[model samples]
Target: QGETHEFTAEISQLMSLIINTVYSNKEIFLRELISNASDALDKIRYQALSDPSQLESEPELFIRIIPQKDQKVLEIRDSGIGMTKADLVNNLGTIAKSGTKSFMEALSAGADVSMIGQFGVGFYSLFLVADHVQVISKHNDDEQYVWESNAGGKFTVTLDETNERLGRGTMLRLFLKEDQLEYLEEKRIKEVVKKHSEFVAYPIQLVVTKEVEK
Candidate 1:
């Protein structure tokens, strides 16, 4: 169903450096991922200018953060431009190969781009809180694909043949570390979002599930 690939030596070292050295500022992982989502949303809107067909499917743009407390998982999804299998590998597996960087580089002048994910290294910051991360994405030209890793120098990319949760864009599920479960709290996530990405153009929604006493 999928192929396993090892991270290049550079990526391996980069992940270890982030996980070991950067302990105090782990909340930035959410900031990094949210910023990436905004960049993707921006990309789809900008590309829609030339090819309106790209907007045919999902015309709306946004980011949703859902915390499944029972499962100890935090899900961040975006209704933005998604990635193909090749993109998942190059952008997530490799170090410093940000899709936003390449997309900006390929754009012509006067493009009026406002992208936040400059360095691809931000994605790896997930290891600061989660032991495992799964990225499910679908691009206009490609089928749904799942990219999964545990920051162990290797990752697996597989074709998603099950429930199609996303019509377009990407969804990342983080398996939270024991001590990192605080991130699953709505209060904490909101505080972080307010502090970091309050001015982001796209809307960030959080799904709250509460059971009232009978």
Candidate 2:
């Protein structure tokens, strides 16, 4: 079982803005997440420069995309610097407090800012396409943890010791909205990645399952 916590007032507003409001470009959700994953990878890579042991378990850094149509789930995973429980609370629970006021104002004013990173609320954009989201992460110094939300006013964080624990990095499993199932298509994901994150440093691999003919 996980511990459930209430979302900060600012975070609640931010989530409402993202989930209830309309945006011209929803595909940016993947782009923003990919960018975050890349940043995490960069951090671990940089730390490894000082301590070689940081890379002992998993050295190669890459991102993986898995789309399941039947389950209406899409997963974007990266071998990056995973977050500890505190990191998850601080990073995901709060919207960089200082930016909350201005960020909310910007959204209330109907700003067409597709680049959410400017306001430090990029992760919330996933709510645009996914009704539910789960972030499973494993850091070198800490045990694996899971952060999950349903775009509601509260979120949960739990210590997960199951086999689902990632060896390293973070994986985002998005329960796509009914109409957002298009994101599960390999072609669609490739297009989005190529269009927005084509210049990303690490490789982004999409798991494609081929059907065998009898």
Candidate 3:
């Protein structure tokens, strides 16, 4: 299905605050996005405790960071519990239990709001560097789908008919902005992981390498 949906009022407002208020320094976004991915992986492994079938398909739970300099792309892939189309629609489309209003008020009052945790809005930080984002996820209960957005208030989700069965996991691909090429570097990514995600329970690896012609 080529179906697409629009974000509600709160979703638009949330993006507006970040796009307008956040500028200059945004490399922290990589840390935030990776944090969420870890949280996602954590959940699946825990569930697998009571349900062995959780990882029956894709047993490994690892993260792979790929930076394609030539293509201006950065991707983070994990073998974790994936989201269904509904999860993507709701998770990306809305903020914590309609908390955007509070988040909005904070911004208007010149107060800083941490838009993560219960709000489920940290995903917005992807716009800090990427011109657009593509999220491909697969869950046993949900078919594989791709979610893409350009930091606009609205986003679209489509069924991935051509995508291989992911077994279970998510892949976040960021289209780096022209000036943000540094984010697509192994040195930078490795540093960020060492400084920020080093203590994360799961082992995070920066394995993406460009094929150099001899």
Candidate 4:
């Protein structure tokens, strides 16, 4: 029971630019995503401090990396404030402020352009690695939704079929390109995780297996 909305042409163009060119460094995606996760953990932790009941049945705040070779998918899972259908459309589909333009303007104008983090378009970095991406989220106040996109002109938001299985969190599945297959390697992923998110409050684990000769 959620309504579907379309993005304005301008917003769509902005999204294209961000996904196509804004991210010069692929490693920064980990930092951006983990920063967002930390923010979510902070929110719930603050709420729970005042009312312990708020934390009842809450999943542990942590990040999990699951690499699927067969599917060519790199999944990042986090227990955080998940997104509803409206949130998925609003946050992912459009940028409220002209943050991208402002950032570019600052860079072109020769201003102190060291801080790219303030642009507020970090989530778009997913497009840099993922040809197709799926975001499955379950919000506390509303039903879950799957936001699917290819960084092309169109994106679809549909009711998530796996909502019941996910308590309250977000799962991002990035369908990596052939050239981007290095992301699936444990050592490379570990380096990126340690470089950007090692200091994060939550535990970050990369799921791997050791071969045992039976």
Candidate 5:
């Protein structure tokens, strides 16, 4: 019922230059994504520590990985500091302000890459495996909303009430590319989880069933 906003010219150019062309190993992407999820959890945990009332709605923090192979979809859901309308617009839609251009300049000069998310580029890494990505989030104060795109320099956002909505958190559903199906393997996910997030503070759970050889 509103106007469609195209990707800002600056962010499109940046994605083309760095993420589209630059390569980071496939496994690294999961690590970065889980880290961001953990960061979100930690943020709200810190807030709740100061004000015990903040934990009234959601006191537990966890990460869930659901892979629907028959449907060729993978979903990562987290209970954490979810985004508001403004947060979604600024975080996902406005990459120019993410400082990625500066990071690329540093890389081109052969400077050692220091940290992840200096410019909020980790989310774009999902495109490494998925042809389409949908993000659904609900903040404590804002109504549930969905953000989605096919990485074509434009995205659409609308109010969503379709689910047993999240009390506070985000969920990413990736309609995976054909070759990326291996990522849905339980073994593969556990390997990546053990490697990258085993030591992370919050609990990380894999909702996967193992089928042993007959």
Candidate 6:
């Protein structure tokens, strides 16, 4: 409806804090991302239950995490409501809603909200272990696109060249920091998933090698 906007000063500061502090454990990254994917799936499934038309596309909602050795990237993809360029800029670059300020105020007041709900600033967690992050999303309402950022106060959004279309979903590509290679391990990611999202509504899958014949 309108031109997209960049994040406000406060939102940028909040993003920095999340990228630097919030998640202390590298393993939690997978869990948090998976939890987000599960939530997205639940939203679509609920919507589809009411409108069969919605089910025509992206009927099977799931989460997948792939470790790419050649590319040195970890990809987390899901069949959820993907974001548009504007949605990406607004959601990822800024926090304009009052909930963010309220959350911060609560934190300042020493409220114990952390144990209960996310303060509405979870996506920024990608910067915790990634030097570069790429988001590929396809929204039912808009064209498929890619968003790239380095957590360095700048980002780029462009039409995806791969032409790999999702019925409706988002894919996160994290170029893991050299020191955070442990996340590339299958065992480590599994443990993280079990710990934070065992009760998630959607199925979580990981690509890995299995012994076929010894």
**Top model number, lDDT:** 2
Better of 5 and 6 by lDDT: 5
The residue-by-residue lDDT of candidate 2 on 1-214, one tens digit each, is 6788888888888888888766778999998999999999999999999997898757889999998778899999988989998888888875346676687788668776575678777888899899899899989988889999989888899887663757889999999988889999989999999999989999999999889999
Q: Estimate each model's TM-score.
A: 0.86, 0.95, 0.87, 0.84, 0.85, 0.83
For model 5, residues 1-214, the per-residue Cα lDDT tens digits are 2224577776665555544544545666677778878988887888888986766667679888889888898888888888876677778865466566676676577743333356566776676677788888887778888887777788877787575577788888888878778779899998988986777888887888567998
Q: After superposition, how far is residue 17 of candidate 5 from its true place, in Å?
A: 4.9
Deviation in angstroms for 77 in model 6? 0.8
User: How would you order the candidates by lDDT, starting with the best?
Assistant: 2, 1, 3, 5, 6, 4
How does each model score on lDDT? 0.81, 0.86, 0.76, 0.72, 0.74, 0.73
Cα lDDT tens digits, model 4, 181-212, are: 88888999999888777688888878975678
TM-score of 1: 0.86
Most TM-score-accurate candidate? 2
Q: How many steric overlaps does candidate 3 have? A: 0
Q: In candidate 2, which residue ranges exceed 4 Å CA deviation?
A: 94-96
- Once superposed on the true structure, which residue ranges of model 5 sit more than 4 Å away at CA? 1-3, 17-24, 106-119, 209-214
Candidate 1 positional error at 50, Å: 2.4
lDDT against true structure, model 2: 0.86
- Candidate 5 global lDDT: 0.74
Q: Which residue runs of candidate 3 sit more than 4 Å off their true CA positions?
A: 20-22, 94-98, 108-119, 210-214
Q: Which 10 residues in a row give candidate 5 its minimum summed lDDT?
A: 111-120
Worst 10 residues of 6 by lDDT: 111-120
- Best-to-worst TM-score order: 2, 3, 1, 5, 4, 6
Put down candidate 1 lDDT per residue, 1-214, tens digits, no spaces: 7798888766776566555543466788888899889989999998898998897778778899999899999999998899999999887765455343443343333321222134455677787788888999988888889999887899999999874668889999999989899999999999999998888999999999998998
